[PDB]
Amino acid sequence: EFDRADILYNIRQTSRPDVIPTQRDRPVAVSVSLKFINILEVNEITNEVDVVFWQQTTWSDRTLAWNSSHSPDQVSVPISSLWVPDLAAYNAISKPEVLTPQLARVVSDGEVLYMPSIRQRFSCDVSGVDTESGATCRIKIGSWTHHSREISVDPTTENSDDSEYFSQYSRFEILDVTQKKNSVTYSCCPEAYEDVEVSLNFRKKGRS
Amino acid sequence: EFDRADILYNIRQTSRPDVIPTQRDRPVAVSVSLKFINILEVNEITNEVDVVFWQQTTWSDRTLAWNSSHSPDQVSVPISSLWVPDLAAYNAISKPEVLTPQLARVVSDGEVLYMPSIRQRFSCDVSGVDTESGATCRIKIGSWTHHSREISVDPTTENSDDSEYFSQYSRFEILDVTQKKNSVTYSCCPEAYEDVEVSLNFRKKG
Amino acid sequence: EFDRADILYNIRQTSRPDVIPTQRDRPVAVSVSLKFINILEVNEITNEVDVVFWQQTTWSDRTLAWNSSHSPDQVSVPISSLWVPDLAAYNAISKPEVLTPQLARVVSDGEVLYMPSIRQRFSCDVSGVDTESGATCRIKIGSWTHHSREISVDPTTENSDDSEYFSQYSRFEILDVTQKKNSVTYSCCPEAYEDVEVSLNFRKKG
Amino acid sequence: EFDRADILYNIRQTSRPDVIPTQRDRPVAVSVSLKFINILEVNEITNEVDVVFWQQTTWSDRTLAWNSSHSPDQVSVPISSLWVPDLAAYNAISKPEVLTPQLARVVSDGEVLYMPSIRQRFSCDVSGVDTESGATCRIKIGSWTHHSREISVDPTTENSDDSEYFSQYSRFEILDVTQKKNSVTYSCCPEAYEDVEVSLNFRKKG
Amino acid sequence: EFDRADILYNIRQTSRPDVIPTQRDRPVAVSVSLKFINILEVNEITNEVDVVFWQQTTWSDRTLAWNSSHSPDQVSVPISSLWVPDLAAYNAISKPEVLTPQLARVVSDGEVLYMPSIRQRFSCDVSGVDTESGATCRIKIGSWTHHSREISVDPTTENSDDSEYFSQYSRFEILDVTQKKNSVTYSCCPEAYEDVEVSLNFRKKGRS
Ligand SMILES: CN1CCC[C@H]1c1cccnc1
Ligand SMILES: CN1CCC[C@H]1c1cccnc1
Ligand SMILES: CN1CCC[C@H]1c1cccnc1
Ligand SMILES: CN1CCC[C@H]1c1cccnc1
Ligand SMILES: CN1CCC[C@H]1c1cccnc1
After folding, report:
1. What domains are there in chain E, each with its CATH number?
2. Number of A:B CB contacts under 8 A?
3. CDD domains of this UniProt entry (chains A, E)?
């Protein structure tokens, strides 16, 4: 039997936050999904957008696991005590501003959910934002330093609505969100790195 | 008999800041209440507001308790030595800027009061800010990661006065502040998460 | 004979920066004085000012004391090794930007002087700033979490000119600086908290 | 046989982050190459530019090496656990804003690749930016404190296309990127310091 | 013989960074000299300037010394491991933005050179900036908390041109840099504090 204090103590003492939780030479499967909350600023001249999204991030780390047969089966853990995937947005032009407490939810089987609210600026196609078909801003996210044999990134499906959490008070409306996944070889390095491309189809609402 | 040094040493040494002070499998009851001090900027086109408020936050942590029959019965404690609720404003568009010393007041029975002055910008309904009925901006606050069996959130009880500490030098005036607690289920997760919705009814002076 | 290394070692090794240096039955007497250096921005529409001042802060901590019959009688100490009063400006709308090295001067009897240069923005009365009688901006400073029995705040007892070090290159000129102690209760808590109100009477130059 | 955990433990335990991995008194050869991603703001009046670039940095540190006959031959390491060259852009007018996770890739033979995305503002020649031949902004990068007997800086670009990773959505387009190795003695100090000058020839599209 | 690792270990283990390296009740002699790199913004209405300068700072700390008959005689050391003079500019209106790695160079006899590149804004006389005589902005630098028996501050000169490292792409040109030493008594305290005043004589380049 463990209480929350015991679980959290054991995790702090033994999770190796700098060690990717790879098992038998297989990639850590990371799921990412952006839930758009607001679009704060758009510039059709510069092709830049300022956006707030929840970055729902999910993966398994079995070194975190504990027998919860007589115990709580989930806890909140500061991310500084956990390994977290080194995800970056490749077309970000500002550093990610995390708006929320930096805590992940860890299940007793080792499943982790880290879902920060992030404000970040992007360079992307803003053309058509003012028309009915709208603009399509693509956001590319992947591990910065782990190639495909170490981290895979997936846009795991749901029925997950588009503007389920998007602000009704925004000047913009979301028409569609699609996720595409890619495998790229960069000039720097010989291995392929996976990314998810998130296409945000949106437009400016008219005053009426 | 303890002096302040002993109380604070004991809190610092046995601090478990990462551990939610859950007792008898009941949620930690957190009270929140926003005391509006200033509205610094409002944009009716973008529906954004920049606000300064004291986020009065209250809860009980029995692991902090000490016998105070012959001791001080209250101390100020760095929040880095305490568990603090992971509250977030859901419609915030900037990160909370804490303007005050990050100290909580702890009572010998384990009651904590943490009341930072916060500057933060929010996405909300700014329409009507210039009519007499004013605008109503809604701010939603709740635990980011603890569901309803772990953290409940409630309005601070004490009969809430609206303009109490609000700046007389602001360009805006407060007409009314109301609160409503909700219980919401999001698609990410199967459990319900509690929030308080704070409705700030305000208008431009003139 | 202690040398500076010994003094600073002893302070650092025994320092309890979390512990208010309450002397028996008494509030720690803190003296505060703002020496205005520059007024960088003024907005008469929003009633906001951006200011730079030296926050002269003085108090006694006898736990720091040492026998200096045959030793240096003063040293500079990082404030992270010292208890420091949790002062806040109640009408501040930005968090204090400290422009100087964060060192206090500690005398062998336990007297401490901490005098940071601070840039901060405030909400206050900017009306009349461009007139002959000028504007009067009031800045309210007090302990954020320590009530009247734990901290008292007074203006430094000197006659002194708080506009003495003000920049000659400023667009503004200071006409007068006055201070008044107040003591107030807040809805949150049953005790009185002390503050100093610093009234800065200033105007634009021609 | 070591697993990733062992490799990272061993590196962390013997991380000598402040020690330049000099061998027998001969300079650490550092390769630098800037991969331009975006040009965000250009001001022809002030001669200032705001740029985003991947700063591909490469060097060898044999103290990091491990036998990978039966082990992973590469790991990602927090740069806080590694010595990293003290490179600075001499004409930068803002501190480097690092946009990416601060991890370097370390090969079992001791080769290190650190490649942060950086946003930084520079002072340089913006004249002609809205002509056809374009502007040429020169960025000078070298070790801040290590002279030529301790750090050598070389452009290894490996010959990969200029506009390769540059945003197609930028307002600007890259015409050409060239590099020059320099060796400058400064008035302060008697030894020479190496730098690479990266010349970005770019324009506004039509 | 010590190697670099030994030197740095020994310094890390025994530097007392909060201890002023006073020897026998003498002041620590600190030399300061500003090498101007750029003038970014000037406002003649508000009397404010935004400047970039190398703040060349030099002093001796005998506790850092080591025998280098058969060892490297200089190392780079993080300033977090060293005592550094608590210098401040008295007319600065922003905090000193350090643009460079925060390393000092330490010689085996205990001489230290710390030379950060700093961007900072000042309140000073901007009048005359677009005439041929130019403006003269005075920058006052001294120890914040150490009086003259603990720290003296002294300007030092080289025969180099003041523009050696001034940007040729600035909108301003430097006409002259001079420096004065002062000893001032403030109201707070009974002791004299030393400062160096650095007078930057500059003007706007021809607009064409
Ligand atoms: C795959 N990353 C994305 C761009 C560069 C590359 C990389 C590789 C190794 C270390 N850092 C970055
Ligand atoms: C209640 N939170 C707000 C948005 C998602 C949710 C959540 C749940 C678990 C871990 N992180 C975030
Ligand atoms: C006197 N303080 C300033 C305003 C609220 C009050 C207070 C009391 C206890 C803890 N935090 C804040
Ligand atoms: C190469 N650096 C750039 C300018 C001065 C020089 C330097 C030398 C020693 C310590 N810091 C800086
Ligand atoms: C020399 N400094 C400049 C103004 C105040 C003074 C000072 C003295 C002691 C501690 N802090 C500041």
Report:
1. 1-208 (2.70.170.10)
2. 77
3. LGIC_AChBP (cd18995)
